[PDB]
Design an enzyme around this catalytic site. Structure first.
Site, short mmCIF file in Angstrom:
data_model
loop_
_atom_site.label_atom_id
_atom_site.label_comp_id
_atom_site.label_asym_id
_atom_site.label_seq_id
_atom_site.Cartn_x
_atom_site.Cartn_y
_atom_site.Cartn_z
N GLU A 287 4.98 29.35 42.80
CA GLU A 287 4.70 30.71 42.10
C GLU A 287 3.32 31.07 42.85
OE1 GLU A 287 6.67 32.44 40.08
OE2 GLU A 287 8.33 30.90 39.84
N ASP B 200 6.89 40.59 40.94
CA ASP B 200 7.54 39.34 41.38
C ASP B 200 8.49 39.69 42.40
OD1 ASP B 200 9.87 40.44 39.86
OD2 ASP B 200 9.69 38.94 38.34
N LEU C 221 5.99 36.38 33.84
CA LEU C 221 6.51 37.66 33.73
C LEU C 221 6.00 38.44 32.65
CD1 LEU C 221 8.89 39.77 34.29
CD2 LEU C 221 10.21 38.62 32.66
N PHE D 99 12.54 28.04 34.25
CA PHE D 99 11.30 29.00 34.48
C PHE D 99 11.58 30.30 35.41
CE2 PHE D 99 6.65 28.87 34.28
CZ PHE D 99 6.46 29.56 35.10
N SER E 49 27.88 23.99 38.34
CA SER E 49 27.02 23.29 38.88
C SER E 49 26.31 22.15 37.82
CB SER E 49 25.54 24.11 39.17
OG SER E 49 26.26 25.32 40.06
N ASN F 280 27.18 23.84 45.59
CA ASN F 280 27.80 24.71 44.58
C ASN F 280 26.31 25.74 44.13
OD1 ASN F 280 28.17 25.07 41.25
ND2 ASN F 280 29.91 25.66 42.60
#
Ligand SMILES: Fc1ccc(I)cc1
EC number: 3.2.1.17
Length: 162
Positions: free
Chosen positions: A11, A20, A32, A104, A117, A132
């Site tokens: 990040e 972002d 965010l 996250f 998955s 996948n």
């Protein structure tokens, strides 16, 4: 190597409001603020989050505090989710970090929808899970970050971050 270092790599750290990869107002270590196109709305969210009038700017201490809250919120969202918790509990500590990383970035609800998955991960079919996981908007839109997370699920090592 731990979830904080991993997400700090993925990040970055910025002390002023930025956008972002989806164009949404964000600050700090990937916090965010809002999906609204209004910068004023983002600034209001920031002031509420920090507890003072910030003018779109925070300190490193404040960024790290928000980051700890955000990591904890991701973990709590996993543990409260009937689809995510059994898979999380089946994983080793390194792969649990990859799971937190995904939550996250995309949120509990989005990751909880990765149904096939998640099944492959719980079955410890690592190569199949990695294939996948890459068949996703997530991988196509942020491929380098998704590749690192997927490699962490595939190998159970920190090799992608070293
Ligand atoms: F519990 C889990 C949450 C997210 C993932 I990705 C894997 C397990």
């Amino acid at each position: 190597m731990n979830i904080f270092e991993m997400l700090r790599i993925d990040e970055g750290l910025r002390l002023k409001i930025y956008k972002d990869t989806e164009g949404y107002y964000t600050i700090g270590i990937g916090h965010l603020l809002t999906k609204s196109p209004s910068l004023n709305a983002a600034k209001s969210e920031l002031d509420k989050a920090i507890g003072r009038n910030c003018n779109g700017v925070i300190t490193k201490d404040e960024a790290e505090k928000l980051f700890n809250q955000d990591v904890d919120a991701a973990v709590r969202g996993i543990l409260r989710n009937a689809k995510l918790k059994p898979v999380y509990d089946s994983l080793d500590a390194v792969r649990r970090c990859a799971a937190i990383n995904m939550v996250f970035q995309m949120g509990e609800t989005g990751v909880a929808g990765f149904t096939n998955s998640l099944r492959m991960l719980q079955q410890k079919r690592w190569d199949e899970a990695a294939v996948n996981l890459a068949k996703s908007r997530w991988y196509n839109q942020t491929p380098n970050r998704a590749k690192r997370v997927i490699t962490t699920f595939r190998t159970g090592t920190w090799d992608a971050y070293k």
